Amino acid sequence: GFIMEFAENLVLRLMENPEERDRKAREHIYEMHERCKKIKEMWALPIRPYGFWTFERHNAQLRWDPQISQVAGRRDPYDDLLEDN
Amino acid sequence: PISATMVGALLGLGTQMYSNALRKLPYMRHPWEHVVGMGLGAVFANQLVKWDVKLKEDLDVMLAKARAANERRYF
Ligand SMILES: CCCCCCCCCCC(CCCCCCCCCC)(CO[C@H]1O[C@@H](CO)[C@H](O[C@@H]2O[C@@H](CO)[C@H](O)[C@@H](O)[C@@H]2O)[C@@H](O)[C@@H]1O)CO[C@H]1O[C@@H](CO)[C@H](O[C@@H]2O[C@@H](CO)[C@H](O)[C@@H](O)[C@@H]2O)[C@@H](O)[C@H]1O
Ligand SMILES: CCCCCCCCCCCCCCCCCCCC(=O)O[C@H](COC(=O)CCCCCCCCCCCCCC)COP(=O)(O)OCCN
Numbered sequence A: 001g002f003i004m005e006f007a008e009n010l011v012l013r014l015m016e017n018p019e020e021r022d023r024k025a026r027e028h029i030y031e032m033h034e035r036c037k038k039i040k041e042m043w044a045l046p047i048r049p050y051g052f053w054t055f056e057r058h059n060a061q062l063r064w065d066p067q068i069s070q071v072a073g074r075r076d077p078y079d080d081l082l083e084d085n
Numbered sequence B: 001p002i003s004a005t006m007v008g009a010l011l012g013l014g015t016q017m018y019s020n021a022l023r024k025l026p027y028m029r030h031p032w033e034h035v036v037g038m039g040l041g042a043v044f045a046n047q048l049v050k051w052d053v054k055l056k057e058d059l060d061v062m063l064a065k066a067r068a069a070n071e072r073r074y075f
Helices: A003-014 A018-042 B008-022 B031-071
Strands: none
Touching: B008 B031
């Protein structure tokens, strides 16, 4: 053929779907705003959590001392006296 | 698209020639260590990507746990 009859549909192939572009734009806005709200919530967390000491890793002694309160140097004076019988 | 190896190998070759130039040497003085640097860069980039994925998922778990713990004050 001639030049323009091919350059026309060439440019038309080069250009994209606008419906896809609009859908992607509204989508991206939706999830970006949702993620923005999520990050805003995340930044509100205090440095020290409400539980803190309640956490099992932050006790480390309520389940260690009971198995140590029997060794010498930690016993209540009234433990060795009546342990004989 | 770049597959974390076309960038890791390029960075390895770049840092090999970069260290080679800082000693005032010809850029391709020792191509065997150039190949070694390419391989090392590719391996390091792949490891970095995998570690990033693992690290992100672990961070998501940590944030979920922290949010659940913080929510308990209201309820
Ligand atoms: C220092 C200068 C950096 C200049 C480069 C900038 C150019 C940007 C491209 C950087 C680049 C490599 C980084 C190279 C760093 C250089 C090395 C530094 C040391 C040199 C010695 C990361 O780029 C992508 O990496 C993705 C990793 O997940 C991340 O996506 C986010 O992740 C989630 C997180 O959990 C987020 O939640 C989520 O929102 C996103 O999905 C993003 O970081 C980004 O999309 C290129 O992508 C590469 O990574 C992956 C992605 O597919 C590919 O391999 C994958 O492996 C499996 C996963 O195990 C997959 O199963 C597999 O399918 C896949 O094959 C590679 O083939 C390649 O594509
Ligand atoms: C970060 C993203 C961007 C960077 C990407 C990096 C890419 C990955 C790295 C690629 C490196 C490629 C290098 C090519 C391989 C060269 C190997 C040559 C090794 C070698 O010849 O052995 C000795 C050289 O010393 C040595 O080479 C060993 C000393 C090397 C020092 C490394 C220190 C690592 C520990 C600290 C890491 C940094 C921590 C920072 C917090 C002998 O040398 P000779 O025979 O020439 O003569 C004696 C001179 N003494």
